[PDB]
Symmetry: C4
Subunit: 164 residues, 4 copies
């Protein structure tokens, strides 16, 4: 497993199954999976910061980001590759030292440039073929957790050490 | 690849899995799937307008339609065939140049008349046989996106060209 | 099939997948499937009324029942068999003329007494084995519709007739 | 099965599929499954108290706990093992006489200590392999009920006797 210094992730279609709940009054919901917070846990356990990139801008995601202690949150992103580059240069790392997971069209550019590109099984075929590792899980099923565990080579020894 | 001038689509059981959330107070929810908006984009990339027909009238749909910049919106539609005939007249096109996707009884008459008819896998056997192309996906799983991409013949080359 | 004069049905685990959504404020949700309203349609089309029995009492159900045009609604029913018997005595029919569908312990006593007993595939084994007809569909997947269609023998001809 | 005098259980990832719904206002939802109340039913039928251990604290869970008449409710638990030990001391009982079901890292320590350990099929492999009985169901699917019926040896005769 190649050395990683940054994990970026998309939200919708990764942290969720793409569901967007509208009510009659202009409110909106997302369904996260508690399983994904272990992604943050494993990352921080290994001293790796985690960033979120999202085209949308919601209080929904901002609260979730906050509670999970994500290192970086970037909502309203127009160009994900662009936002990723800014942050890399900000952190003095390059894209090759980055792991990214996204599920749709606006992810494809960044996915093509990163050290490890992950895509959920639920994603469309032309995006899915951009992944450089296989992810069994679908968005919403803890696929962020799967990505992180595979990217940092988490193993039974790590597990054993954290429950002692 | 029949010449398509108009893509029309039902809402419930196509954009959703038929789910209708009711609370204790009269509010109501639908769960849409972000993946479906890629349906509008590919449509628009090809200069094809999209119209929504629905027997229901909800603020839920109005907001989602507006958010996705759907070309035409008809709610309360008592008769889907006629309502499509009208927009076809008001556009100088023929039903044959229309792609429609629906999942249920009140879509049946319009499905039999269109040039391309799609029914999602989750639909009742009677409707599913009226489909003129096979759709692998279920309501709410991005079956509207699958439809548009089939109807419009979207290919890898299209994808390569919009991610630049 | 038998001569059915009343169709009865449970709510949670039949008309839903058993999901009960609680929020932080005391409110509650259920998710119905639009597919199931076709169940009422066919019943009413063949001249057969539909009743709902439910041990729970919610505005969720009452409004859904009303929207769907359900003939009868009994909530907070602790003995579903008593409830059905009273409705039968008032209609002038017996239980062998009833088709009932439920999914759990408090439906067993009624299930064993009616002319046609349906049980969704998702139900616990002890309840499934009481089913007198096979149902492929799970709670909330439009299994009430499937029940009605099997009980009344809905066929392609019936479909052809009603789509004008 | 071995003699069990107390059944304990996690919430998220067991009573739910791990879903955590966020709206734009800071409110929050969990999705329970009515099937799981039967687990409480069977426990009480046999004179076994049930306890909830959870690291979170929500009105969501307090309300559910009350509705289902759960004997013990511990929220805000930092250490699930010591919470179980404290209650075990209170009831005059040993961990060997406890059945516990959990699904994630914070459940591991307790799971390796109890008489019977249950882990839903949806859990991480690391946790799953601590289960001492196989469980088919995923969290939110009625896996708490499954756990209870296996732990207490509920059989056809039990069922027959309570539907009299
Ligand atoms: Mg996405
Ligand atoms: Mg429909
Ligand atoms: Mg039920
Ligand atoms: Mg858990």
């Amino acid at each position: 497993m190649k050395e990683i210094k940054l994990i970026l992730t998309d939200i919708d279609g990764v942290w969720t199954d793409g569901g967007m709940f509208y009510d009659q009054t202009g409110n909106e919901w997302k369904k996260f999976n508690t399983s994904d917070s272990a992604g943050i846990f494993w990352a921080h356990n290994k001293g790796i910061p985690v960033g979120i990139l999202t085209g949308a801008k919601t209080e929904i995601v901002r609260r979730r980001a906050e509670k999970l202690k994500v290192d970086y949150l970037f909502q309203g992103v127009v160009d994900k590759l662009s936002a990723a580059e800014e942050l890399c240069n900000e952190l003095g790392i390059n894209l090759e030292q980055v792991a990214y997971i996204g599920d749709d069209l606006n992810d494809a550019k960044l996915l093509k440039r990163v050290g490890i590109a992950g895509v959920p099984a639920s994603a469309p075929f032309y995006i899915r073929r951009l992944s450089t590792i296989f992810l069994e899980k679908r968005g919403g099923e803890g696929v962020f957790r799967e990505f992180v565990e595979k990217v940092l080579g988490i193993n039974l020894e790590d597990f054993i050490a954290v429950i002692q």
